[PDB]
Amino acid sequence: EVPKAVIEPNRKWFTNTRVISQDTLQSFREAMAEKQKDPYTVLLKSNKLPMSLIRDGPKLEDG
Amino acid sequence: RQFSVLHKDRKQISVGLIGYPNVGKSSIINALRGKAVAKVAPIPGETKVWQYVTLMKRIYLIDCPGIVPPNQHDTPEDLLLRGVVRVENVEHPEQYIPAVLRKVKQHHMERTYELRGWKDHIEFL
Amino acid sequence: ETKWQAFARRRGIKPKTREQRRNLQYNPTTGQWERKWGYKGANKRGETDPI
Amino acid sequence: PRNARSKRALEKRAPKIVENPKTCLFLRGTTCSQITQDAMNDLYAMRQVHAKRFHKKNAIHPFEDATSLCFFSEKNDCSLMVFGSSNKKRPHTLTFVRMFDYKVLDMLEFYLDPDTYRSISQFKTSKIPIGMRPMMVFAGTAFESPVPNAFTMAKSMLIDFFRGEPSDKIDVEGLRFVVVVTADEPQKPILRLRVYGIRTKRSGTRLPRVEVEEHGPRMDFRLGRMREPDPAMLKEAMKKAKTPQEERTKKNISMDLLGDKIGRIHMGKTDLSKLQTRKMKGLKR
Amino acid sequence: MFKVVKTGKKTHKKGWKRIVTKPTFVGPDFTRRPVKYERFIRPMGLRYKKANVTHPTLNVTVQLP
RNA sequence: ACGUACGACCAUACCCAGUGGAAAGCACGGCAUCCCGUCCGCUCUGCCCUAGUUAAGCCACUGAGGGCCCGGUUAGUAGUUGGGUCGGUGACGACCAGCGAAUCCCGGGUGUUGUACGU
RNA sequence: GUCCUAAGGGGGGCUCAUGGAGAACAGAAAUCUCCAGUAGAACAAAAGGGUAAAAGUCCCCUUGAUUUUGAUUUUCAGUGUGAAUACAAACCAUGAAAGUGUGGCCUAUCGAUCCUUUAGUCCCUCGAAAUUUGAGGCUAGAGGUGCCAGAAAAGUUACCACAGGGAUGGCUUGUGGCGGCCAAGCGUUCAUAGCGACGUCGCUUUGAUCCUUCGAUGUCGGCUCUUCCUAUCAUACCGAAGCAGAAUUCGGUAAGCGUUGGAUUGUUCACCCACUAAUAGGGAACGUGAGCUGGGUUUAGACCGUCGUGAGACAGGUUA
RNA sequence: AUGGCCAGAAAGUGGUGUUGACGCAAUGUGAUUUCUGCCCAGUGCUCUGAAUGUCAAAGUGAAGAAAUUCAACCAAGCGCGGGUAAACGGCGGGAGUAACUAUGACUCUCUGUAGCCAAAUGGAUUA
RNA sequence: GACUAAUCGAACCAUCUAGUAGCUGGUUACCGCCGAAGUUUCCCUCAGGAUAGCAGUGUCGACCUUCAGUUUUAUGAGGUAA
Ligand SMILES: Nc1nc2c(ncn2[C@@H]2O[C@H](COP(=O)(O)OP(=O)(O)OP(=O)(O)O)[C@@H](O)[C@H]2O)c(=O)[nH]1
Ligand SMILES: [Mg+2]
Ligand SMILES: [Mg+2]
């Protein structure tokens, strides 16, 4: 059977879902800068974050 | 067990075994299980399809066939000495004896086959 | 723990999601969005229609 | 609670994990001296924001029966009490009463000196702004008793009275007023309450030089009758609730500085001494 | 939406498994359920992570995760 | 000391009536284009500070009737417990204490004060 | 039985019940005006001190009817982008602002022609007669799943058997989708909107990298032999290209004539190497289907893996 | 052995049994070589250890004129409390303590180009 | 799950027994007069029911009242063209 595929009007569709502050961005950039690798630690749950705004840019010769 | 405790929220964890052919993936599964649950042979490509083995209630093991990632610098001699292929199905198996004689020390070969005094692989064979 | 809560814990009845329990439904015949209950709810349908 | 405002009132009066700022009720007895009224006025001026005030005469003796005090606490949602009274035997009494679940947790009596008392208006200084939380300094050897006594309870009452609203941050301009309570281990010792505004000066280094100036009131007390709490009620009152923002530490689970959940594994020492290698034909002499 | 995935070696097959025939988004840190308890099959070839999104006001189209 | 603007105590400040108020300040006031709002420029809002006026508001003082606020007396007394007690068949009659009133009566009073700017 | 752009929230203005004195109808009781009016009205609760330029009452704005995020709290999850929940933060509403406030409340279900229970003295019968208990009938009441009883008759068969039924199409082909702009034209010219080809613009490595191959429910093959189509690989002819020659490339007419061995079954058997003029693609089955013969493939025997207490079933793998 | 395992409708009935633990019966595994991931104690196996908690029939007491009703007493098993074939099953370690026994709970931190040691060999890559 | 006289996931023989089936197959001269039917309404649906409606034979009643898938007239709906 074919359902009625309809979308209700809602104010939540036109708002921002995830926001971040500049201080939080600076803290995450510093954490990314001082991040180190440990073979005896595993990753269990990634944090949903703007990696494009957090991680550093490429090298100038590559750019 | 530590991995299962770290993933206690899931119903179980799955441990897939990867590597080249004849590195001992099915043998490792059999040793962890304590019982011959996966087929084991010295013939490469014995495991052809993926297989689930219940190790514990919350631990599964997945046997996988052996993979060889392609490289432009890998030679057929290198693959054969890595154990990728079966030597029954290769053409002119005699050409790979110098690689074996380079890899193996001479006195080990002499005590293995009780044979001394060859100038080359032709005379050794 | 109330009688319903004890019964649901015994019978494995999960709580409804917030999207599932919304006071909103789509009426096909009118092609409009209406409320299930409350003011002009769907439980009082036809109490004010002419026929 | 049919009305929404009434529902808001009951939800405000409901028990919480993080409790509301503490409310004190200032009330009088049937007979109360003018010096006691001035003392309660000074304490109310210290604690205007979180206090309510009665203006009638109440026939209450707290050390005989405190049913009316419990009723007032339940009705007004006040849980600290300052009861003023006067008598021939005790001329100027301030009865500090602390509730727990709308019943009497504990009580203490303070006896005000009529001669050395000076109100806030007696000092010609700049006064404390309304709603500003002062700092506290407790001095002397009377507050370090190994057994809980009247001085320990009085220190608890005064800390709870001048607690104000807790906050994780404070402006450096909100460090201008201090309340100092001095009391010595001993016929009865004298507990002295003073308030000082702080003037700060240069001293040639990073830390500044602190100078004080009296702000008022000037109060001297003798500790009198004391009603101790029940041990079970005291344990239930000193139970500490945990905030949902206070996480529960799990073994080998942490959160890194990027917010990822990180698990720890432990390999142990590799001991290959108990391994027997294969006795191959080529390895035999 | 769902086609029946048949299992078994008999001529008659069990038909409890369903395969999603439309593109899906599985989210981060995704591990598939084991085959004994995987009712819904979302194949790896039909998984998408990015989309071409247009801003109606800015009149631009950018590929976004 | 007086006035004004913010206040603190929140009747000693409230209810009623009478008399007076230099200076300045408040206030009554005058005018409805613009801002603004009403059934009504009554209120609110805008413009004038000129002209009249202390008539009212405001302040001071007086006067009754109330009310209110202090101190003594009541009184360490009624009343409530300890049941400490001396005798007593025991109870009771008495002391010893710990808390602790109120009515009635007497006397006094009818606002103090902070900051800033002025007279 | 009628009524409502719901309640709630924020802001602003005003003061109520009553008493006295006044006003055509209006006369104890209709409305208007003044004065006095600590609330004696209203609204919530059950003060022994709730609220007066308000928590009362009317105006203005929102009404979007239960927002988003969370590595955190608690519970759960064979459908683990987690869900519900608590808390926090952001957002939102209002206001000049200080601020204030919201982003729900609950509950197993089933009978009422049912279940439990009470009374009849002057109600009937207990059939050989009478009395007393007891029982049945008939009649009239009470209450409503806390105290109104109860609501637990499963699988498997690949060891098998029987009775029967059953076994989209004048489709397709060579050129993407979404969004914007332009646009010859169509309409419109009391509205100047709306359809719109041709186009164009955004998203989908300096000849690199080779350290990213992304899931069988859908089954094909092989010989042996004949024929047909053209959507032409070669051979024949022709047109064009810096096509000098040679070798070609793009295209046209053309099915007359050919279009081959071979390797690889750890496997979607599809790709390699060679000879060659060239090693073109399809149909006549696959819109179910008796030539032969390997795989999809599967009666009965058997192990191994997964599930199940088990009979057995499968994510599966192997053998006859 | 006044036994176990069976059989028969029963029997003064039969077998094992012309038997007696180097035996009989039931299971599982399946020559030899190798071989027992580490630790428990949730399900289960078994302890006549105290209880009446559940508690049938028969039997006992009371009321009534009796039918009848109400009471205790109440075997085994179950329940409670102990040890395991520790079989199934669960089980990431090591330290501490304030709990003091089961369940603890609250912190800490864990990563030899052919040897050595074992009664010639170090094996299942088993003829 | 092999064998137990070509018979075995329960042998053969006779009887109960003409066992049961809603499922399959079949069901025997002619002419004449009529002559159909698919949510109407109610019930928990499938492995469901009744029921309305439509028909034929007989009759009987004064086969009495006449009624009619039609138009017109009056008045509604469609005021919509014009
Ligand atoms: N000496 C020694 N030999 C080993 C060990 N492990 C495995 N082998 C041998 O190596 C061979 C490995 O065969 P498998 O167990 O099938 O390993 P595999 O990689 O799964 O083989 P494929 O099926 O081809 O992929 C076996 O024949 C063993 O004899 C080991 O630990 N020591
Ligand atoms: Mg192998
Ligand atoms: Mg293998």
mmCIF file of N, CA and C (backbone and C1' of nucleotides) in Angstrom, chain A residues 10-12 15-19 45 47-48, chain G residues 64 67-72 81-82 90-91:
data_model
loop_
_atom_site.group_PDB
_atom_site.id
_atom_site.type_symbol
_atom_site.label_atom_id
_atom_site.label_comp_id
_atom_site.label_asym_id
_atom_site.label_seq_id
_atom_site.Cartn_x
_atom_site.Cartn_y
_atom_site.Cartn_z
ATOM 1 N N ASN A 10 6.666 23.451 9.701
ATOM 2 C CA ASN A 10 7.251 23.483 11.031
ATOM 3 C C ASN A 10 8.350 24.532 11.054
ATOM 4 N N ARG A 11 8.402 25.300 12.144
ATOM 5 C CA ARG A 11 9.435 26.319 12.293
ATOM 6 C C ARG A 11 10.818 25.717 12.497
ATOM 7 N N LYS A 12 10.898 24.449 12.911
ATOM 8 C CA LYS A 12 12.186 23.813 13.163
ATOM 9 C C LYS A 12 12.978 23.557 11.886
ATOM 10 N N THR A 15 15.577 26.684 11.226
ATOM 11 C CA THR A 15 16.481 27.103 12.284
ATOM 12 C C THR A 15 17.801 26.354 12.171
ATOM 13 N N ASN A 16 18.786 26.828 12.929
ATOM 14 C CA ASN A 16 20.079 26.164 12.995
ATOM 15 C C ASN A 16 20.009 24.996 13.968
ATOM 16 N N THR A 17 20.537 23.846 13.553
ATOM 17 C CA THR A 17 20.529 22.671 14.413
ATOM 18 C C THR A 17 21.760 22.606 15.306
ATOM 19 N N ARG A 18 22.930 22.933 14.764
ATOM 20 C CA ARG A 18 24.184 22.861 15.498
ATOM 21 C C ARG A 18 24.930 24.176 15.345
ATOM 22 N N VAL A 19 25.330 24.763 16.472
ATOM 23 C CA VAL A 19 26.092 26.001 16.492
ATOM 24 C C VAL A 19 27.334 25.791 17.345
ATOM 25 N N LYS A 45 33.812 6.368 20.238
ATOM 26 C CA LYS A 45 32.714 7.191 19.743
ATOM 27 C C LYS A 45 33.272 8.534 19.308
ATOM 28 N N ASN A 47 33.286 12.404 18.113
ATOM 29 C CA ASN A 47 32.515 13.594 18.446
ATOM 30 C C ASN A 47 32.123 14.322 17.168
ATOM 31 N N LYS A 48 30.830 14.599 17.020
ATOM 32 C CA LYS A 48 30.328 15.316 15.852
ATOM 33 C C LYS A 48 30.757 16.775 15.940
ATOM 34 P P G G 64 -0.880 28.205 16.098
ATOM 35 O "O5'" G G 64 0.263 27.293 15.466
ATOM 36 C "C5'" G G 64 1.547 27.831 15.164
ATOM 37 C "C4'" G G 64 2.655 27.060 15.840
ATOM 38 C "C3'" G G 64 2.764 27.265 17.350
ATOM 39 O "O3'" G G 64 3.236 26.063 17.957
ATOM 40 C "C1'" G G 64 4.769 27.961 16.320
ATOM 41 P P U G 67 9.265 19.258 21.690
ATOM 42 O "O5'" U G 67 10.007 20.335 20.782
ATOM 43 C "C5'" U G 67 9.730 20.436 19.392
ATOM 44 C "C4'" U G 67 10.760 21.280 18.683
ATOM 45 C "C3'" U G 67 12.185 20.749 18.708
ATOM 46 O "O3'" U G 67 12.421 19.778 17.703
ATOM 47 C "C1'" U G 67 12.182 23.049 19.276
ATOM 48 P P U G 68 13.465 18.581 17.947
ATOM 49 O "O5'" U G 68 14.889 19.292 17.915
ATOM 50 C "C5'" U G 68 15.410 19.846 16.715
ATOM 51 C "C4'" U G 68 16.709 20.564 16.970
ATOM 52 C "C3'" U G 68 17.798 19.734 17.631
ATOM 53 O "O3'" U G 68 18.523 18.951 16.699
ATOM 54 C "C1'" U G 68 17.610 21.824 18.730
ATOM 55 P P U G 69 19.142 17.536 17.132
ATOM 56 O "O5'" U G 69 20.385 17.922 18.047
ATOM 57 C "C5'" U G 69 21.491 18.640 17.519
ATOM 58 C "C4'" U G 69 22.435 19.066 18.613
ATOM 59 C "C3'" U G 69 22.855 17.976 19.581
ATOM 60 O "O3'" U G 69 23.875 17.144 19.060
ATOM 61 C "C1'" U G 69 22.273 19.925 20.788
ATOM 62 P P G G 70 23.838 15.563 19.329
ATOM 63 O "O5'" G G 70 24.517 15.411 20.758
ATOM 64 C "C5'" G G 70 25.765 16.025 21.030
ATOM 65 C "C4'" G G 70 26.032 16.102 22.511
ATOM 66 C "C3'" G G 70 25.624 14.892 23.328
ATOM 67 O "O3'" G G 70 26.530 13.810 23.215
ATOM 68 C "C1'" G G 70 24.947 16.858 24.443
ATOM 69 P P A G 71 25.979 12.334 22.898
ATOM 70 O "O5'" A G 71 27.192 11.382 23.282
ATOM 71 C "C5'" A G 71 27.647 11.289 24.623
ATOM 72 C "C4'" A G 71 29.148 11.189 24.686
ATOM 73 C "C3'" A G 71 29.763 11.272 26.072
ATOM 74 O "O3'" A G 71 29.718 10.045 26.781
ATOM 75 C "C1'" A G 71 30.967 12.654 24.560
ATOM 76 P P U G 72 28.594 9.777 27.902
ATOM 77 O "O5'" U G 72 28.340 11.199 28.578
ATOM 78 C "C5'" U G 72 29.185 11.678 29.615
ATOM 79 C "C4'" U G 72 28.425 12.451 30.665
ATOM 80 C "C3'" U G 72 27.295 11.720 31.367
ATOM 81 O "O3'" U G 72 27.737 10.803 32.353
ATOM 82 C "C1'" U G 72 26.601 13.914 30.825
ATOM 83 C "C1'" U G 81 21.897 7.833 11.877
ATOM 84 C "C3'" U G 81 22.905 7.808 14.012
ATOM 85 C "C4'" U G 81 23.193 6.500 13.300
ATOM 86 O "O3'" U G 81 23.966 8.228 14.851
ATOM 87 C "C5'" U G 81 22.995 5.248 14.117
ATOM 88 O "O5'" U G 81 21.671 5.166 14.620
ATOM 89 P P U G 81 20.986 3.756 14.887
ATOM 90 P P G G 82 23.641 8.941 16.250
ATOM 91 O "O5'" G G 82 22.735 7.875 17.009
ATOM 92 C "C5'" G G 82 21.595 8.278 17.750
ATOM 93 C "C4'" G G 82 20.541 7.201 17.757
ATOM 94 C "C3'" G G 82 19.376 7.420 18.707
ATOM 95 O "O3'" G G 82 18.383 8.268 18.159
ATOM 96 C "C1'" G G 82 20.201 5.224 18.973
ATOM 97 P P A G 90 22.889 30.012 27.085
ATOM 98 O "O5'" A G 90 22.444 29.766 25.573
ATOM 99 C "C5'" A G 90 23.394 29.813 24.519
ATOM 100 C "C4'" A G 90 22.863 29.179 23.257
ATOM 101 C "C3'" A G 90 21.641 29.833 22.635
ATOM 102 O "O3'" A G 90 21.953 30.983 21.868
ATOM 103 C "C1'" A G 90 21.321 27.500 22.714
ATOM 104 P P C G 91 20.952 32.241 21.854
ATOM 105 O "O5'" C G 91 19.639 31.692 21.137
ATOM 106 C "C5'" C G 91 19.641 31.369 19.755
ATOM 107 C "C4'" C G 91 18.447 30.526 19.378
ATOM 108 C "C3'" C G 91 17.104 31.231 19.386
ATOM 109 O "O3'" C G 91 16.878 31.979 18.205
ATOM 110 C "C1'" C G 91 16.914 29.115 20.447
#
